[PDB]
Paper text:
Here, we characterized E. limosum Tub, a tungsten storage protein. Tub has a sub-nanomolar affinity for tungstate and contains a single TOBE domain first characterized in a molybdate storage protein. Crystal structures revealed Tub assembles as a hexamer composed of a trimer of dimers, capable of binding eight tungstate oxyanions at two distinct binding sites located at inter-subunit interfaces.
Isothermal titration calorimetry (ITC) analysis revealed that Tub contains two different binding sites for tungstate. Their individual binding properties could not be determined and the estimated Ka value was 1.00 pM with a saturating molar ratio of W to Tub of 1.44 ± 0.04:1. rTub was resistant to trypsin digestion both with and without added tungstate but was converted to the trypsin-sensitive monomeric form by TCA treatment. Similarly, Mo-loaded Tub exhibited the same thermal stability as the W-loaded form and was also resistant to trypsin digestion. In all crystal structures, three copies of the Tub dimer are arranged around a non-crystallographic threefold axis to form a spherical hexamer of 32 symmetry of 45 Å in diameter.
Author numbering:
A (entry chain E): 1 to 71
B (entry chain C), D (entry chain D), F (entry chain B): 1 to 69
C (entry chain F): 1 to 70
E (entry chain A): 1 to 74
């Protein structure tokens, strides 16, 4: 499906740390940036994510804050 | 402040659409990637954000989903 | 795209409240239940949402709280 | 308590997956729909949740995205 | 209703800024602390919120991050 | 970094429950109030959090709901 989430960034799985009900997936999205995602193990398995998979980090605009260097 | 948010991505403001109590800030983070942020107008003002300002897109890991084709 | 969001609930748009930068879409998901979604106006336009449109409410499991009668 | 969260959907617990600090509660809300909720084990215990418990899925409007085919 | 949100903080409304579809409510929770809440106008009206109302800031634990001073070297 | 998060509440760590990939940090922020935070174990470690550490509970305004009696 097509989603309203304003942030949908293509990337490659670099690591998967499995937990009890959740795991943490790291995505290399290019330009030297990586995105860490804390999601359910159910989705990590069901999506077939493993190191090297093509995927997207998907983030709703209301979940994204803005910060600055306070110099 | 140093924050627990796993995602702290440097970038430049490319647009700011102001709203009533919130506004939407778009940040170019490089590599052809842009991040859209919906935050309070009060914070857009207090941080002095305008097109061209340096900033960071800050995202908690528990807020990030994974997608595939 | 297939998403990790554990909750993907089919529904019918019943109303759309346009705001300044955000809007609120109400989805009838059947059985007398509706889901309200506060999203960007840009997304409402890009997806072509209108009253009567078929859509899905998408919710990450970590965004869902549980309640009970006390 | 009466909460501002616009989404409050009654349901029946169909499973509870206990984890280390969190667990996952699956609620059948009727009509073939289920809601999965990832919450703290402390709250799962303090709410007395069990399979078969009556409960509610509570979701802030700002946490709900819209999708289309 | 009884909720799983780990954070349920009693306070009194000190201000309400109305927007187009959302508004921002500020709660004095004591100890010199205030909580800002961005929620729908529908809920601000439906809950009868006005300056002086008793209320709660309700926050899921998974929404709360931890910060420390920059001059801390873990 | 200075953050758009409208809520930045100073407090002291009163408990740490370590989990598998997340943990739960509780902060005493004064006035008889405590704030619970579910964050990644990586961040609990990198920030050096232990009982008694000075910290801030950081919360975006759009994550805060309102309740009443
Ligand atoms: O208890 Mo966990 O570390 O969220 O799987
Ligand atoms: O450690 Mo976090 O604050 O869940 O990204
Ligand atoms: O368009 Mo709004 O009411 O400022 O979020
Ligand atoms: O689904 Mo949105 O438009 O990123 O809040
Ligand atoms: O945290 Mo999920 O498994 O993307 O709903
Ligand atoms: O508490 Mo709301 O009005 O669902 O964002
Ligand atoms: O994730 Mo909780 O236990 O509803 O705050
Ligand atoms: O939505 Mo905010 O202004 O980053 O708390």
């Amino acid at each position: 499906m097509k989603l309203s989430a304003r942030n949908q960034l293509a990337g490659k799985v670099v690591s998967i740390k499995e937990g009890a009900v959740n795991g943490i997936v790291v995505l290399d999205i290019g330009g030297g940036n990586q995105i860490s995602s804390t999601i359910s193990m159910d989705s990590i398995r069901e999506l077939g994510l493993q190191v090297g998979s093509d995927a997207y980090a998907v983030i709703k605009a209301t979940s994204v804050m803005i910060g600055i260097d306070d110099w």
